[PDB]
Design a protein around this ligand. Structure first.
Ligand SMILES: O=C(Nc1ccc2c(c1)CNC2)c1cc(Cl)ccc1-n1ccnc1
Lengths: 156, 39
């Protein structure tokens, strides 16, 4: 069905009404989302079907129709935009300066914006509009708010 | 059965709402892809 580049909502009719479980990026004929959104299940796009191609539970990422295409990286200095797509609400860009997740295997950029779980998979962008990662996997801080990593896959 | 619906273009928007802080957090990532705080 629709394969035009852009941001899309991931919906399900299995629960009550139509519920938004996540978000994803269509780029170069490949649909990119977080693993926890679909759990690797097939997706529908109108009459067409999207089948999983690559995925990893630890990275929390999954690609459909082809390999992961997103390879822009946060420069470690500039503000970024979360192109937030919340359930039942219009897509909206939010500009923020990312924090840092310090891990035993290196540092990762992190965005401190609190959105509903159904916003998981919303792309994070650089000043050129390139997707530097997806929002939706992170930690719940002492306050109760969510701080998400800037999760980026690898382009083979 | 899951389905997708278009929500917009991927573009940087000048004069967008600037918010959010930049915390430095010590975290650990387990095999199930779940982050946790290290204190
Ligand atoms: O649940 C969320 N994210 C998630 C879920 C399941 C899994 C993972 C991440 C990675 N391994 C499996 C979540 C996402 C957002 Cl955007 C805001 C809050 C969230 N949240 C986490 C706790 N309570 C709420």
């Amino acid at each position: 069905g629709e394969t035009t580049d852009g941001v899309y909502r991931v919906m399900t009719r299995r629960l009550l009404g139509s519920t938004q479980v996540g978000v994803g990026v269509m780029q170069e004929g490949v649909f990119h989302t977080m693993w926890h959104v679909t759990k690797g299940a097939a997706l529908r796009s109108g009459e067409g079907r999207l089948d999983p191609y690559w995925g990893d539970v630890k990275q929390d990422l999954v690609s459909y129709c082809g390999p992961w295409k997103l390879d822009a990286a946060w420069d470690g200095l500039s503000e970024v935009q979360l192109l937030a797509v919340p359930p039942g609400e219009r897509a909206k860009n939010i500009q923020t300066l990312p924090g840092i997740f310090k891990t035993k295997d290196g540092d990762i950029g992190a965005v401190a914006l609190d959105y509903p779980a159904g916003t998981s998979g919303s792309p994070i962008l650089d000043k050129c509009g390139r997707v530097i990662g997806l929002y939706g996997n992170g930690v719940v801080i002492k306050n109760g708010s969510y701080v998400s990593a800037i999760t980026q896959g690898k382009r083979e | 059965d899951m389905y997708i619906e278009r929500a917009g273009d991927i573009t940087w928007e000048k004069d967008a709402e600037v918010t959010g802080n930049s915390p430095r957090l010590d975290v650990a990532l387990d095999e199930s892809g779940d982050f946790s705080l290290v204190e």
